[PDB]
Amino acid sequence: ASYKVNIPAGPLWSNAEAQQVGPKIAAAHQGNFTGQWTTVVESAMSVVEVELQVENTGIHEFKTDVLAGPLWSNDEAQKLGPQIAASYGAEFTGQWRTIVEGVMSVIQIKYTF
Amino acid sequence: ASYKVNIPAGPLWSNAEAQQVGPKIAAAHQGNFTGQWTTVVESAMSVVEVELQVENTGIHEFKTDVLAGPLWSNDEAQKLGPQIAASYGAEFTGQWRTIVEGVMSVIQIKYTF
Numbered sequence: 001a002s003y004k005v006n007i008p009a010g011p012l013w014s015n016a017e018a019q020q021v022g023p024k025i026a027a028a029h030q031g032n033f034t035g036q037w038t039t040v041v042e043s044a045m046s047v048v049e050v051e052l053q054v055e056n057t058g059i060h061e062f063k064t065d066v067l068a069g070p071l072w073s074n075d076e077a078q079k080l081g082p083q084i085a086a087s088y089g090a091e092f093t094g095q096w097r098t099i100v101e102g103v104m105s106v107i108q109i110k111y112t113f
Numbered sequence: 114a115s116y117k118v119n120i121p122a123g124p125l126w127s128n129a130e131a132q133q134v135g136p137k138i139a140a141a142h143q144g145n146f147t148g149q150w151t152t153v154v155e156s157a158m159s160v161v162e163v164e165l166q167v168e169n170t171g172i173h174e175f176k177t178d179v180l181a182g183p184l185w186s187n188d189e190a191q192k193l194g195p196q197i198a199a200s201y202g203a204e205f206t207g208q209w210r211t212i213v214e215g216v217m218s219v220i221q222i223k224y225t226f
Contacts, residue, residue, distance in 0.1 A: 001154045003154050009199060009200055027183065028179070028180050029180070029200065031187055033160065034177055040116035041116055046125055052121070054154050060217065062219065065175075065211055066177060067175065068141050069140030083123050083137070086122065087121050087123075087141060087142065089121060091183050099175055103185050106177075113213075
């Protein structure tokens with residue numbers, strides 16, 4: 001199954017640029033650009049409508065760390081990791097670390113494509 | 114300046130769960146959960162509305178690689194990199210590399226917080 005969300009694209013100056021760039025942003029998020037887009041902050045930010053899969057499948061994988069917000073402990077990270085990872089369209093591997101005490105932590109996620 | 118987008122959260126089974134999870138996903142994406150949410154695929158996927166800032170500033174940073182879709186040349190990476198980075202709420206450092214020939218590349222982004 002799939003669904004749609006708007007994803008930031010930075011400023012998009014024309015429909016011509018949007019139709020060229022939208023598919024690139026979508027591909028980076030394992031989705032497909034629908035053709036619809038909106039400037040949300042004049043000369044500063046636009047978003048593109050991207051169709052995403054509830055579950056990404058494929059035979060390749062890539063692992064990396066992304067922001068997780070500040071996490072209190074490993075036990076909380078194990079509890080919240082899966083959902084935070086799902087917000088990136090990926091899975092949580094269980095690995096994580098705080099990078100700035102009281103401010104920010106990161107989790108390792110796994111992309112399948 | 115700010116703007117709002119819906120971010121995947123996986124299935125959310127009650128408003129209570131959404132209010133507990135929404136802030137965590139928002140914090141992982143450097144935004145503020147608005148309290149609003151929607152299920153987009155019954156029993157499989159819900160999204161939480163998050164207010165993002167056009168520009169994320171701060172004295173701390175974290176660099177990492179993220180999916181960039183397939184990139185065919187340094188020229189395309191230079192052109193698309195900042196835009197793809199913006200789609201992650203971050204900045205493009207200029208570094209990138211293909212991870213699966215003809216299928217996928219990644220770019221290095223810098224989160225500032």
